[PDB]
């Protein structure tokens, strides 16, 4: 749901800056001179910012020492087929990278293995002045930081090709984090129409980092490896910790929980990490089934949740959902649905980014409208 509030940002801004610094007359010559005798060096560019630089492959030496001399002999003898194969091996590295760049505007994410192999990436990770906790984090999940990395194509000047690798550098690690799933909660009155629906809009990831919580509204923007949730702070909101109160007391005065209202009496299902939430309404069939026994539980027209212990699949109407096979304890908290605390014909049925304060104010204002036009008659 949420996510329209994030605000825009430049994903490849730092790599763009490095490219623009690299577009100087002698900047290519600075890198060329510093890397003339070694395969790896640090170069302080003209802006004052130092940068690690790799010379991963030297095609010039191969061509000008083992390919060009064989070609020019006044007789185009080759004397062995092996030369063409060795050429197609060293040229293979160049050919793949230039192909991939030509399909992504020079911005390829994730970084390919051909562009930057894991051994070189491991060396790049191992050789930065960062806390060893972050070094191990990036070492054990090199393909994860790879999928959160970028590529920027800089220059092809005098005799060298250079491009920028934009890795992420994680500043918040090993802090409490959690995910929140919400499903529509509606009234189950016997009437066909006139239903009332209310839903929490604060779905997504919540990570405590420094005094406050970073909130990620899209489930796509965060990758998970079985304990650790890798997220991007650029597409995130910063909220006080009082949003936590919305889980227990949604009418709490310490924070305003954002919600939405609808008259959309529609059944749906939400698969959570260790179970599933089922919103069953109307005359829709809702079933929790097990692969060994079969159908094991039916949903009685409400907001329900079932653990993944003995359940393997869920079918609502014609939609088949497969439960996650993750392990962990699940806690069911009883409590009457909040929507029963409002009466219809006063409940605003078209709100999309409203809150507890907003809906309550409209109901209070509408009730004042009803009363102040009747005390006068």
């Amino acid at each position: 749901f949420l996510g329209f509030l994030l605000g825009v940002g430049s994903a490849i801004a730092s790599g763009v800056a490095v490219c623009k610094v690299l577009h100087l007359e002698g900047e290519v010559n600075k890198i060329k001179s510093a890397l003339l005798s070694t395969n790896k060096a640090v170069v302080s560019l003209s802006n004052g910012v130092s940068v690690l630089t790799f010379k991963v492959l030297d095609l010039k030496n191969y061509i000008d020492k083992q390919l060009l001399p064989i070609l020019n002999k006044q007789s185009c003898s080759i004397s062995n087929i092996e030369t063409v194969i060795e050429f197609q091996q060293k040229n293979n590295r160049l050919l793949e990278i230039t192909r991939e760049f030509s399909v992504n505007a020079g911005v390829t994410t994730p970084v390919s293995t051909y562009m930057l192999t894991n051994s070189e990436l491991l060396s790049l990770i191992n050789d930065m002045p960062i806390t060893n906790d972050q070094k191990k984090l990036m070492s054990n999940n090199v393909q994860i930081v790879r999928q959160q990395s970028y590529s920027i194509m800089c220059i092809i000047k005098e005799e060298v090709l250079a491009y920028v690798v934009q890795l992420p550098l994680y500043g918040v690690i090993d802090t409490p984090c959690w995910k929140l799933h919400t499903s529509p909660l509606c009234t189950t009155n016997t009437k066909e129409g006139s239903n009332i629906c209310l839903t929490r809009t604060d779905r997504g990831w919540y990570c405590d980092n420094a005094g406050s919580v970073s909130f990620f509204p899209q489930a796509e923007t965060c990758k998970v490896q079985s304990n650790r949730v890798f997220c991007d702070t650029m597409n995130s909101l910063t909220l006080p910790s009082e949003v936590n109160l919305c889980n227990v007391d949604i009418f709490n005065p310490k924070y305003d929980c954002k919600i939405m209202t609808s008259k959309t009496d529609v059944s749906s299902s939400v698969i959570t990490s260790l179970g599933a939430i089922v919103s069953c309404y109307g005359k829709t069939k809702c079933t929790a089934s097990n692969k060994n026994r079969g159908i094991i539980k039916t949903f009685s027209n409400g907001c329900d949740y079932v653990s993944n212990k003995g359940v393997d699949t869920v079918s609502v109407g014609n939609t088949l959902y497969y439960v996650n096979k993750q392990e962990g304890k699940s806690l069911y908290v009883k409590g009457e649905p909040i929507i029963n605390f409002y009466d219809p014909l006063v409940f605003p049925s078209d709100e999309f980014d409203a809150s507890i304060s907003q809906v309550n104010e409209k109901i209070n204002q509408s009730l004042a409208f009803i009363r102040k036009s009747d005390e006068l008659l």
Binding site: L36, S37, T38, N39, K55, L57, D58, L59, N61, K90
Partner: protein
């Protein structure tokens, strides 16, 4: 654990004539990036090493083009087309592909000249040192070539093992060397014997100089 072998360890040269030093690696020095990182360094006496060659072939800045480097696999060569006076120094080969690099034994460069038989002199310990309760016998081997030479000490025809120290200076402007052989004995042992002889073997003949203190 790479072994770098330089050959030869003592190179007599002639000015204006080429010279070459061979360096052999115990392992292949080809690097994973397609380069070979072997460097050649020059070291004059009393000075720090100065790099002449990097990546086998590339010449460093400020090196006369008379120096050249070649090689591949495990065999490499440093070549001087016309050896000049300033080329008389030490030269080292260094593999740089594998961390943290390895140096060869080193090569000393000297000027080749004709064989010159040495002038041999012998000097008894002075009376003052005899009062100082020690005795030293000094054998001088002046203006010879080549540097290889054998010195033996006999006290009353007894060959001496230990108690003798030998010094050789660097090649002079006549392209010759010298040598000082000092034999140390206690004054009691010195006064206990009569014949003291220094025997010299070189590309002349076998020459003995002797004297009889007591």
């Amino acid at each position: 654990v790479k072994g770098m072998t330089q050959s030869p360890l003592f190179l007599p040269v002639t000015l204006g004539q080429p010279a070459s030093i061979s360096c052999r690696s115990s392992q292949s020095l080809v690097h994973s990036d397609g380069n070979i990182y072997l460097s050649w360094f020059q070291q004059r006496p009393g000075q720090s090493p100065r790099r002449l060659i990097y990546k086998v072939f590339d010449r460093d800045s400020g090196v006369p083009d008379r120096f050249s480097g070649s090689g591949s696999g495990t065999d490499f060569t440093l070549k001087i087309s016309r050896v000049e006076a300033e080329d008389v120094a030490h030269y080292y080969c260094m593999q740089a592909t594998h961390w943290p690099g390895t140096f060869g034994g080193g090569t000393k460069l000297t000027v080749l000249r004709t064989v010159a038989a040495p002038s041999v002199f012998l000097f008894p310990p002075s009376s003052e040192e005899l009062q100082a309760n020690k005795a030293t016998l000094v054998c001088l081997i002046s203006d010879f070539y080549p540097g290889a030479v054998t010195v033996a000490w006999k006290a009353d025809s007894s060959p001496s093992k230990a108690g003798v120290e030998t010094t050789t200076p660097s090649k002079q402007s006549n392209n010759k060397y010298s040598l000082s052989s000092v034999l140390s004995l206690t004054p009691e042992q010195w006064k206990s014997h009569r014949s003291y002889s220094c025997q010299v073997t070189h590309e002349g003949s076998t020459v003995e100089k002797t004297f009889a203190p007591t």
